Design a protein around this ligand. Structure first.
Ligand SMILES: [Zn+2]
Length: 733
């Protein structure tokens, strides 16, 4: 029996909670309410960060999911799918599911942070005179009221202030004209202020939200490009599609495009890349030519070399302000299911009519594949023949992508067909369909069937439907959780089918024989949501980790993935003011709290903790032999952390990680940087490198102190350190 500790609970909303999602970089829980709003809560102190409505249609069923492999958040409604990511430590969730407009006069929602809005207001009131521009008074008044509402919350909590964004409701063409006027007015005065890149990013986001204001990229000889259209980084890196030197080490499109260069070739096959700010003539590129060093040498007066603020638009701002594309061009079909698998770089979306669109959300948001599933495939036909005019209706209920060898799409389909009774009866059968993803550069064509896996007899007998598909942490096994499909005896709670992936051929396939079948004989224990726990947390036939599932009645079950035996049981809490069951609906894992965070029926959040000195052979009492001292010395070495950790800084610092400080006196007295490791392991040390001012004539009395971040509740030192003096772990130095 495994021990689970309960140390309290928190109240998020009184409207209830349905699904949960956790962002590991910002330690933020994105709880999904039953009314469609997304409530972002911090995971370090219990103080809620923000609330969002995603600018979607009212009454829509918002479903939010997170991917840590690509570090992107997917929001799926009944209409469209939106992709978001972190931007300067906050998530721009106000316009996450914004439908792209078709005309210039449509009112668009423009969400902006606090420092950007303050710089825009300071420029418009001090350095920029744009009173002749259309819509100037409305934008000025909206900026003023947004800043005057934000400044009250600014002095209370810094993280809630940074998460708070001002949403302007203005027409698209008016905002575009205002931003163009700001860019021109700041360009004619030759002043390098912070409002210029803000306005450039704003106008690039507005141009990206409207496909009608996106002219075609005219990359060709004898034709100049539009520099104002080339202010975006994505267009500059798109211009290198015909680059003949992709195989070069440093002359690659992605590292060389971010320096502010675009391909303007005079012929077909050359390497002429011009800057979009200083217009430096560069030819005969070399594989050893570092882009930053070449831009510094050939143009030291370029503001990118000095780091000054230009009209550049970073790709992170465009990705954080990307629109929500519909799975079809008609935009009227409703999405039945979504998800991600062992290759989550591509995002799949299937409609109820049988059309699947796959987007490359890992790269820039574009159309990657679009096809329609035909239910009358020969493999489906012969599987239905082996099961027993001809009418077949196929509906997808789960989506996954499996990869070890190009990736393939796994769709969990349900086939309903009229069969004679041995009057016609509509029988349902769940199957798995494999479709090709990667296009051709006799291999199968994309959009065609690869493997038609047939589920065993109990799925057809009980009319079960494929509820969830999840690849295991090993990468060699796959789990399918079923449930009773409602119709428009002994009721079962579903089945857990563990399959083995097949990599015998060049295409990712599965095996017909299931490697494990587990039954849920209790109808009350119907599986609603699942999560997988990494085994290294327990390190503080090989075992395949632990699986945490939520039931219909709210009983959280933690089971070993090898045999699906009930190891840990968590009863649902009781509602306040009564004896009703506050049944758990969804569960996620919070790394910052190191706890299972589960949402209740009443909207509460509960954190469950997993896990709970003599008799050791020490390394001291032994005699001083050579091997023991050698093992002690080999123990005391240090290694570099890989991959990248997580960290956030105050916005006065702009960007193994480095930053540059800007002269801001709003919070000059204190600076708090937060660090979250990707995994709790053996802490060696932290290296803190600094470069000071060149005009320093006196030794500064400035101290840096490391502190253990406190877990949230479920000569005299500085007062902030006095507040956390007991839990200190380094310094003062
Ligand atoms: Zn330049």
């Amino acid at each position: 029996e495994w021990l689970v500790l309960r140390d309290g609970c928190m109240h998020c909303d009184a409207d209830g909670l349905h699904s949960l999602s956790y962002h590991p970089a910002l330690n933020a829980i994105l709880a999904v309410t039953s009314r469609g709003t997304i409530k972002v809560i911090d995971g370090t102190s219990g103080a809620t960060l923000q609330a969002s409505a995603l600018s979607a249609k009212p009454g829509g069923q918002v479903k939010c999911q997170y991917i840590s492999a690509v570090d992107k958040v997917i929001f799926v409604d009944d209409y469209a799918v939106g992709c978001r990511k972190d931007l300067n430590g906050i998530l721009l969730l106000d316009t996450a599911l914004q439908t792209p407009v078709s005309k210039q006069d449509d009112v668009v929602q423009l969400e902006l942070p606090v420092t950007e809005a303050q710089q825009l207001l300071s420029a418009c009131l001090e350095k920029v005179d744009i009173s002749s521009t259309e819509g100037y008074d409305l934008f000025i008044t909206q900026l003023k009221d947004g800043l005057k509402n934000t400044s009250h919350e600014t002095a209370a909590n810094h993280k809630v202030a940074k998460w708070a964004t001002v949403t302007f409701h203005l027409p698209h063409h008016v905002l575009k004209s205002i931003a163009s006027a700001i860019v021109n007015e700041l360009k004619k005065i030759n002043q390098n202020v912070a409002a210029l890149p803000v306005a450039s990013s704003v106008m690039d986001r507005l141009s990206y939200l409207l496909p009608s204001a996106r002219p075609e990229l005219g990359v060709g000889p004898g034709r100049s490009v539009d520099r104002s259209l080339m202010y975006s980084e994505a267009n500059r890196r798109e211009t290198f599609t015909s680059w003949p030197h992709v195989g070069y080490r440093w002359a690659q499109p992605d590292p060389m495009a971010q320096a502010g260069f675009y391909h303007q070739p005079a012929s077909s096959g050359d390497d002429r890349a011009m800057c979009f700010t200083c217009s430096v003539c560069l030819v005969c590129w070399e594989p050893t030519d570092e882009p930053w060093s070449e831009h510094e040498r050939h143009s030291p007066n370029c503001p990118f070399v000095k780091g000054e603020h230009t009209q550049n638009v970073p790709l992170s701002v465009t990705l954080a302000t990307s629109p929500a594309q519909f799975p079809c061009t008609d935009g009227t079909d409703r999405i039945s299911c979504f998800g991600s698998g062992s290759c989550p770089h591509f995002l799949a979306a299937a409609t109820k009519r049988g059309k699947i669109c796959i987007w490359d959300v890992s790269k820039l948001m574009k159309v990657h594949l679009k096809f329609e599933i035909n239910a009358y495939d020969p493999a489906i036909v012969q599987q239905l023949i082996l099961s027993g005019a001809m009418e077949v209706s196929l509906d997808i209920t789960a989506l996954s992508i499996l990869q070890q060898p190009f990736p393939c799409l796994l769709a969990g389909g349900l086939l309903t067909y009229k069969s004679p009774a041995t009057p016609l009866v509509r029988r349902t059968l769940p199957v798995l369909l494999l479709y090709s993803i990667k296009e051709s550069d006799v291999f199968p064509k994309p959009g065609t069937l690869v493997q038609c896996l047939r589920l065993p007899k109990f799925a057809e007998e009980e009319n079960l439907c494929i509820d969830s598909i999840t690849p295991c942490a090993d990468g060699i096994h796959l789990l399918v959780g079923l449930r009773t499909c409602p119709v428009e005896r002994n009721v079962s709670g579903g089945y857990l089918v563990l399959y083995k992936m097949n990599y015998a051929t060049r295409i990712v396939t599965l095996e017909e024989e299931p490697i494990k079948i587990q039954h849920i004989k209790d109808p009350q224990d119907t599986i609603t949501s699942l999560i997988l726990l990494p085994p290294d947390i327990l390190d503080n036939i090989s075992t395949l980790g632990h699986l945490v599932i939520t039931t219909q009645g709210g009983y959280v079950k933690i089971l070993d993935l090898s045999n699906f035996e009930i190891l840990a049981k968590v009863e649902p809490p009781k509602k306040e003011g009564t004896e009703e069951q506050d049944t758990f609906v969804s569960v996620i894992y919070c790394s910052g709290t190191d706890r299972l965070c589960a949402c209740t029926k009443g909207g509460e959040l509960h954190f469950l903790q997993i896990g709970g000195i003599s008799g050791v052979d020490l390394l001291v009492d032994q005699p001083f032999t050579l091997e023991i001292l050698t093992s002690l010395v080999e123990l005391t070495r240090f290694e570099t952390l890989t991959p990248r950790f997580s960290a956030t800084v105050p916005p006065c610092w702009v960007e193994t990680r480095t930053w540059k400080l800007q002269t801001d006196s709003n919070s000059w007295d204190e600076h708090v940087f937060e660090l979250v490791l990707p995994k709790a392991c053996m802490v060696g040390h932290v290296d803190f490198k600094f470069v000071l001012n060149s005009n320093i004539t006196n030794i500064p009395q400035i101290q840096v102190t490391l502190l253990k971040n406190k877990a949230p509740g479920l000569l005299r030192l500085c007062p902030f350190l006095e507040d956390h003096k007991e839990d200190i772990l380094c310094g003062p130095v």
